[PDB]
Amino acid sequence: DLAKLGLKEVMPTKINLEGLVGDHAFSMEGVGEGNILEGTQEVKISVTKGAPLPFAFDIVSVAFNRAYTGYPEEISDYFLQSFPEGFTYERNIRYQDGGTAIVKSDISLEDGKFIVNVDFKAKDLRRMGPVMQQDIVGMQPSYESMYTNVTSVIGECIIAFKLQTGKHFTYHMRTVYKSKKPVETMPLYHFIQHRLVKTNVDTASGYVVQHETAIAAHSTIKKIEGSLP
Amino acid sequence: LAKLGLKEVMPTKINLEGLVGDHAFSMEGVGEGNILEGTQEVKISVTKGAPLPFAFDIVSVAFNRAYTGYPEEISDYFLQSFPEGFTYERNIRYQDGGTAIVKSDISLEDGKFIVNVDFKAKDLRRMGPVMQQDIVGMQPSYESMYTNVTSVIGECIIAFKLQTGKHFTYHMRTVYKSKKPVETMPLYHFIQHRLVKTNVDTASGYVVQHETAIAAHSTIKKIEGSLP
Amino acid sequence: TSKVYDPEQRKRMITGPQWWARCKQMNVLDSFINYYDSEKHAENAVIFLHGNATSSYLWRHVVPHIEPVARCIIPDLIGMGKSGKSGNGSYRLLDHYKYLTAWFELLNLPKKIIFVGHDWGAALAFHYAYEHQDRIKAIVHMESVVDVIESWDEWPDIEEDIALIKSEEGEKMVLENNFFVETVLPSKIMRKLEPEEFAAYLEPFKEKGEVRRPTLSWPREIPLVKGGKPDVVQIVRNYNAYLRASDDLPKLFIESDPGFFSNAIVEGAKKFPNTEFVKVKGLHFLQEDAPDEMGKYIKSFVERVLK
Amino acid sequence: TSKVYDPEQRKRMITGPQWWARCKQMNVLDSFINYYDSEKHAENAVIFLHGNATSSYLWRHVVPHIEPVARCIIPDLIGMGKSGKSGNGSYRLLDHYKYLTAWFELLNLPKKIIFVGHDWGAALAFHYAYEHQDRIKAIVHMESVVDVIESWDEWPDIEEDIALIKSEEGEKMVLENNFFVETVLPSKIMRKLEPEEFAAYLEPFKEKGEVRRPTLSWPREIPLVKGGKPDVVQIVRNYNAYLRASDDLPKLFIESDPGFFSNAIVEGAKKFPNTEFVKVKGLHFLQEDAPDEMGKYIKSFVERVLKNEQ
């Protein structure tokens, strides 16, 4: 029942990001909508302050909501239960380079849309790395392990930026999501499969449009009956 | 295809030499697995340093990517590396800061997978689930697999389940290097693993683990005309 | 959890019947106490006190290192091991303390006794130490009950489980499912116990029901400042205030590495003067992982306190 | 790559036709050369030399800072920009050099010339300065070919890419797919170019076929001592030794940060005597990211070079 949670099948969203990459401070904005029953979302992002960016854009693609996640019946939805109040999250990113990133976000629900407020910080990125070189074509699909820790939910994944050379550049992303309110049922260990793509690049618009599909499920390999865990 | 000197069902003998903190030990393993379906079962013994002052499950991933079910749409970099075999170097970072280095070689002689492993762990927390031995087993995982010139990079998050029901993760990055020049290098896929422990009844002092690994692409259809 | 055997332990394994055949019994109050006595060198008496879910069997390999120096007595607490049950069926801290001191009265003990307390067995070895302060020469404690608990900062993840035990759920955990015997005991031992020595621990509680009441009543006496039993909290407060002032009392702290409670109590144990610190392998039941090391350590300790 | 516009660039944007309507053509051998000429202040000559995939357009925002102090001339290399084509259809380094020297002779230049080269445009200058050591007053270079390539260490991951370019497939990559203009040109620029600014670069190579042969032959002249053209290798070695022996030649290096080639070439640039080093933000085409700062640097450097009369 999404009506009691102040939601509907299709939900709009407005995200505001304040970023600090190295010494470069910037401010970005995104507007979009998506299906919270099928885990689809599409947001077009623009830069409001600090343009242009001396770094690769795709590092802020994960900062622009787990409410857009297709959860089956046999897995409880922590993030949709987090509403109408919403939920916050703290995200630590370590690129396969030594450079790090901290992403503190707060997904609220106002009137009838998700109001997200993200803070993005990055440091120790490499001069010849594909972030400062902007060799990144996009984001490959990923699998985020999601489990429970008392009142919070912890997700962990390895995101692989594809490069123009066909090679890949990975970063480990560990997020801790906390619902603002006690929330009833906590989820078991599962995965969320993500696919974040960029749609309109043959349209020189100044926007950067991204569509994310995130479907939650368990392991498809059957567990042995005599198997311990 | 026995041109690489293989069979659909293959036996394996693994010899591990490990050091955790200041504890030196030797472990052995005898197993059998299907390399086309990608399943493997290994009985593991401790031939030196028993008993172990740490959680055992940290050595489960050190005990052979030849036991992976690769579909026809994905290149099997591991099966192509034979008859010579392949080596790999594995760096593991536990979520509390503990580190592990696993250097392994996989050869073939009579028609068996002879694996030689060197395991070195360090900086484990005394209150961590490895020193406290709070780990029940390993949860299923997904390993990114992509090509890097001639090497293959795998990367995953392995989650131990704890006795209290919580979980303890570690980030694993493996560089696989073939011994022979491999024909076709793969694109970018994921190997889904499920490593479990069977025959949990006390019996003798041996650990039997069964791992199922299946390679596949993403199950989400890519929107046409989108990047990448 | 997966454990492996000690390759050089089945040759020197002491089974349950082999241990009880060397143990004596004696009527104490309205019951009796099964205990082991070395008898020789009765001029100095050292007493080994086990904690929860264990018995005298815990000190079967530790005691052969100290007997040729002093008379070592190891009792099975009331309702545990091969001893008898308590009259009222209650197994709180004082319910063990009364029977234990009454059994002390029937032992021909010297003026100042030496205690070796582990887990709750230390609390008794401390509570007596607070009541009969003139009757102690030395104290050896490990994985003990040092002071109260107020934070859970560097403690094992036993919270919520403690709250589960304190509620009705714990009754199904311990009485019907034998939690501390089927789960806690083999988990907190780095090595894999042989089946005989594990049956030696399971024997007193192999049956379902009220007989496993001590193993359920022991953790419910935990000295939590918030939620704990006020009487036990005050008891431990008093004897911790006494132990911090025991300047002349030579003490020995054995820290299990990595241990189960050692990391959370080694800082509170440093507040006890005249304390000599040693450390060695094991988890909670460090007597099963490094028995000979502990035996040599405390043998030297008692040799030098006798000086 | 995504990239986003500079919010204050379209106000001062110079389109293709606007920049071309300020240039001049001049017969050079069996062809002609389109070039922007400041004319005024002919007492000194500052010649800007672009590299691959570009033209004089590259300096459109850099040149206004140096014009008040010296006559600035910026040509489109042969077969590139709005310039004429080659006679033999060949676009190796030596043909560009021949047309460039024949165009040099027709400009009424002073004895000593000041050069500002980018990419291959530096090498050309680096070549000229080696053969005409009497005609050089100062040299500015950025993302240069300072020396030969002996290892791929600090260089960007352009190996195999250049191997695909030199191994037949470069024809389908550049002549068919327009690799350097459609892909490599916008990628090596931090900001997003306005549609007119990108059309100004696409115009000379908007058609498929041999018209993109320059952009294909520029990378094939890469000075790899193992696997590269030995003639360009010898040219680069000669002028690198000459520049290393040039203490009387004031130079200015403009390091791109993070850059594209600067990380691998700034060492060889440091081993050049009398080199003043500055740093500006950008990738390879640093002119399209820090044009005003680059112009100020070049103008103060020329100013201090001209101040030498004690």
Ligand SMILES: O=C(Cc1ccc(O)cc1)Nc1ncc(-c2ccc(O)cc2)nc1Cc1ccccc1
């Ligand atoms: O081949 C050259 C010439 C050269 C330049 C500097 C130097 O120190 C030595 C030789 N350069 C080159 N060599 C290779 C590449 C290149 C090739 C493929 C690719 O994907 C990216 C860059 N680019 C370039 C230059 C360039 C052109 C257009 C846009 C940016 C940069």
